[PDB]
């Protein structure tokens, strides 16, 4: 294998053991393959091609899978790809991803030629995922001062890091010029910056750290650095997590729970009004994602083997649907703590959900067909 090489994949279709839903496995479970982060574009607009990470060449690299032809083309090569943060451009003509922790790359999908768009400078370390605006002309991301950075290779390191008050800057990068601007810089752990879809003037970001210790999880700031404000004031004992933009940019959605009760709730916040509203209760899930207008949501039942199910929430109906099993082990493969995360999202047609599981050996990609009962 190498950049540009093609491999044919077998698609194995069966019925879910619990729900009877049609499920198709897309990748062979003797090779580690996984989907990207759920909020990053991986399907082309017409739903015919799919970006994923695979280990066929040895390390984990990007591939584009033609879902009609069942051929995967290797997009990137070498040992330093972050195969989770990558996304397709709006026009389906480019892949953006980070190589060697520092180099934000653009890959031309026709030629497979790469260009380095931006390099995190020497005195800083890129943290987390770079996220584009809807126009795909700008990126936001976090850089942490090298002096303050440590490799966060386990959950104890991740826990302790919060108390060090690392110097973090929220960067915005121009994709055409490669120029960078600091939006915000503070001595506290900043994370998950995400442009509001169709509103470049609004950037959401978090205070990373233990859920029950952070002053407030969710923040908004204007693109120019002005008007930094919290999305909500946490009630006593309240944790807020799993925040994401509805892809149409209508609302910020998140999960809320209170110390003393296991119950989880989906909430929505209006970005202009900052009214936060409780939408529905949910089973404990590890992630949450919606379709384009937030009329459907999907979540992956959490580890304690506790809950092997994928749930779909019909937000028009207020109904909840146990649609299929993910059956992931949640185990670490090759040091990576995200690789077995199901990370469900909807196909562009809203008929299927895409997720990772290692149920059949190594991590693989699956598509589960939503039952007619989701829409009654
Ligand atoms: Ca090779
Ligand atoms: Ca509004
Ligand atoms: Mn995850």
CA of 19 to the centre of ligand 1 (A): 41
CA of 1 to the centre of ligand 1 (A): 4
Q: Strand ranges (DSSP E) for 10-137?
A: 12-15, 22-25, 33-34, 49-54, 61-66, 71-74, 87-88, 94-99, 103-108, 114-119, 124-132
Answer yes or no: are the C-beta atoms of 164 and 209 closer than 8 Å: no
CA of 196 to the centre of ligand 1 (A): 39
Domain count, the chain: 1
Annotated binding site for Mn(2+): 287, 338, 341, 343
Neighbouring residues of 323: CB distance < 8 A, sequence distance ≥ 6: 19, 21, 309, 310, 311, 312, 353, 368, 370, 371, 374
Distance CA 73, CA 77 (A): 11
Cβ burial, residue 315 (10 Å; 0-12/13-18/19+): buried
Distance CA 107, CA 90 (A): 14
User: Resolution in A for the shown PDB structure?
Assistant: 1.6
Expressed as residue numbers, the domain containing 176 is 1-376
Q: What are phi and psi of 194, to 5 degrees?
A: -140, 120
If DSSP states are collapsed to H, E and C, what string results for 157-216? Answer: HHHHHHHHCCCEEEEEEECCCCCEEEEEEECCCEEEEEEECCEEEEEEEEECCCCCCCCC
Continuous H helices in the chain: 155-161
| Residue 332, domain CATH | 2.130.10.10
CA of 270 to the centre of ligand 2 (A): 5
Answer yes or no: are the C-beta atoms of 62 and 3 closer than 8 Å: no
Distance CA 152, CA 156 (A): 8
Other C-beta atoms closer than 10 Å to the C-beta of 135 total 11
CA of 36 to the centre of ligand 3 (A): 10
The alpha carbon dihedral of 70, 76, 79, 83 has a sign of negative
Neighbouring residues of 345: CB distance < 8 A, sequence distance ≥ 6: 35, 38, 39, 42, 289, 298, 353, 354
Answer yes or no: are the C-beta atoms of 173 and 118 closer than 8 Å: yes
If DSSP states are collapsed to H, E and C, what string results for 91-113? Answer: CCCEEEEEECCCEEEEEECCCCC
């Amino acid at each position: 294998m190498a950049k540009g090489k093609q491999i044919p994949l077998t698609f194995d279709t069966y019925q879910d053991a619990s729900t009877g839903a049609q499920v198709t496995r897309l990748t062979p479970p003797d090779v580690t393959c996984h989907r990207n982060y759920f909020y990053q574009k991986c399907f082309t607009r017409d739903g015919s091609k799919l970006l994923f990470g695979g280990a066929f060449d040895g390390p984990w690299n990007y591939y584009l899978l033609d879902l009609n032809t069942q051929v995967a083309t290797q997009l990137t090569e070498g040992r330093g790809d972050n195969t989770f943060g990558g996304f397709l451009s709006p026009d389906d003509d480019a892949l953006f991803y980070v190589k060697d922790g520092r180099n934000l790359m653009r890959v031309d999908l026709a030629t497979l030629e790469e260009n380095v768009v931006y390099q995190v400078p020497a005195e800083w370390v890129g943290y987390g995922t770079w996220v584009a605006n809807s126009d795909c002309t700008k990126l936001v991301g976090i850089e942490i001062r090298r002096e303050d950075w440590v490799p966060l290779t386990d959950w104890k390191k991740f826990h302790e890091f919060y108390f060090t008050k690392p110097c973090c800057r929220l960067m915005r990068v121009d994709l055409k010029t490669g120029e960078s601007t600091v939006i915000l810089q503070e001595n506290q752990w900043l994370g998950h910056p995400i442009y509001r879809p169709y509103d470049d003037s609004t950037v959401a970001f978090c205070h990373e750290g233990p859920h029950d210790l952070v002053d407030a999880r969710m923040w908004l700031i204007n693109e120019d650095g002005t008007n930094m404000r919290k999305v909500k004031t946490h009630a006593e004992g309240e944790s807020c997590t799993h925040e994401f933009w509805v892809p149409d940019g209508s609302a910020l959605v998140y999960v809320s729970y209170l110390k003393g009760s296991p119950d989880r709730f989906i909430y929505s916040a209006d970005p202009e009004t900052l009214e936060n509203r409780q939408l529905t209760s949910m089973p404990a899930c590890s992630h949450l994602m919606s379709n384009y207008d937030g009329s459907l949501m999907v979540g992956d039942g959490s580890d304690a083997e506790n809950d092997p199910f994928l749930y779909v929430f019909n937000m028009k109906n207020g109904t909840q649907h146990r649609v299929a099993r993910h059956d992931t082990s949640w185990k670490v493969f090759e040091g990576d703590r995200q690789v077995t995360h199901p990370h469900p999202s909807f196909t562009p047609d809203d008929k299927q959900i895409l997720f990772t599981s290692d149920v059949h050996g190594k991590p693989a990609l699956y598509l589960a067909t939503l039952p007619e009962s989701v829409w009654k």
